[PDB]
Amino acid sequence: KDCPWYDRGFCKHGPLCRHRHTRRVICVNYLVGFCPEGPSCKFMHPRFE
Amino acid sequence: DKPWRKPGADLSDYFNYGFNEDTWKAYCEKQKRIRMGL
Amino acid sequence: AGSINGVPLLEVDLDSFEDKPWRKPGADLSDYFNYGFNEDTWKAYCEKQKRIR
Ligand SMILES: [Zn+2]
Ligand SMILES: [Zn+2]
C-alpha cells in the first residue's frame, strides 16, 4: 500500500489517513522541469493531477 | 486549525519528499503559474 | 536548481541526447516533462529563463 495523496506530496489527514504514507524522495530534475530517465529514474516524479 | 502545525505532530506524516508547509505552497504556486501563463 | 552530470538543467541541449525516448508515439511524457512541458515548450521555457538571469 501507498497513499495516493501523499505520493503527490501532501495529505490533509496525515496520521489519520486510512492508507500508508511511504516516505519517498523527489527528483530535483523533475522538480525544475525535466528528467531524461523518466520511469527509470531512481527518484520520484510526482504527478500534480 | 491545521494539524501538521502542532508540536505533537510530525510534518513528514503530512508532507512527502521533505516538503514544508512553505515549500509545498511554493510548489503549488509554481504549478499554477507554469501550467498557465508566462 | 537542476543539473545533469555537471551542467545546469536549463543549459543542457535536448538535441544532443542519443535516446530521446520522449518522442515515442505514446510515451508517458509526464514521466519526463513536469508541468505539462513538451520538448519544444521545455526548450522555450529554458530559453526564456536564460535570457532573464
Ligand atoms: Zn494519506
Ligand atoms: Zn528523475
Author numbering:
A (entry chain A): 122 to 170
B (entry chain B): 147 to 184
C (entry chain C): 129 to 181
Quoted passage from the original study:
In mammals, the cleavage and polyadenylation specificity factor (CPSF) constitutes the core of the 3′ end processing machinery onto which the remaining factors, including cleavage stimulation factor (CstF) and poly(A) polymerase (PAP), assemble. These interactions are mediated by Fip1, a CPSF subunit characterized by high degree of intrinsic disorder. Here, we report two crystal structures revealing the interactions of human Fip1 (hFip1) with CPSF30 and CstF77. Taken together, these results provide a structural basis for the multivalent scaffolding and regulatory functions of hFip1 in 3′ end processing.
To gain insights into the CPSF30–hFip1 interaction, we determined a crystal structure of a CPSF30 fragment spanning ZF4 and ZF5 domains (CPSF30ZF4–ZF5, residues 118–178) in complex with hFip1CD (residues 138–180 of hFip1 isoform 4) at a resolution of 2.2 Å. The structure reveals that hFip1CD binds CPSF30 in a 2:1 stoichiometry, with one hFip1CD molecule (hFip1CDa) binding predominantly to ZF4 and the other (hFip1CDb) to ZF5. While the overall conformation of the hFip1–CPSF30 complex is highly similar to that of a recent crystal structure of human hFip1–CPSF30, with a root-mean-square deviation of 0.82 Å over the whole complex, in this study, 21 additional residues of hFip1 could be resolved in hFip1CDb due to extended crystallization construct boundaries, with 16 additional residues at the N-terminus (residues 130–145, isoform 4) and 5 additional residues at the C-terminus (residues 177–181, isoform 4). The hFip1CDa–CPSF30 interaction surface (803 Å2) is almost twice as large as the hFip1CDb–CPSF30 interface (478 Å2) because hFip1CDa binds at the ZF4–ZF5 junction and has additional contacts with ZF5. hFip1CDa and hFip1CDb also contact each other directly (215 Å2). ZF4 interaction with hFip1CDa is mediated by a hydrophobic interface centered on Lys127CPSF30 and Phe131CPSF30 and supported by additional salt-bridge contact involving Arg144CPSF30 and Asn159hFip1. In turn, the interaction of ZF5 with hFip1CDb is mainly mediated by Tyr151CPSF30 and Phe155CPSF30 and supported by a salt-bridge contact between Arg168CPSF30 and Asp159hFip1. Interactions with both ZF4 and ZF5 are mediated by a hydrophobic patch in hFip1CD comprising the aromatic side chains of Trp150hFip1, Phe161hFip1, and Trp170hFip1. Moreover, superpositions with CPSF30 ZF2 and ZF3 domains reveal that the interaction surfaces on ZF4 and ZF5 are located on the opposite side of the ZF fold relative to the PAS RNA-binding surfaces of ZF2 and ZF3. We subsequently performed size-exclusion chromatography coupled to multiangle static light scattering (SEC-MALS) to analyze the stoichiometry of hFip1CD–CPSF30ZF4–ZF5 complexes. hFip1CD and wild-type CPSF30ZF4–ZF5 formed a 2:1 complex. In contrast, CPSF30ZF4–ZF5 proteins containing Y127ECPSF30 or F155ECPSF30 mutations formed a 1:1 complex with hFip1CD, while simultaneous mutation of both residues resulted in complete loss of binding.
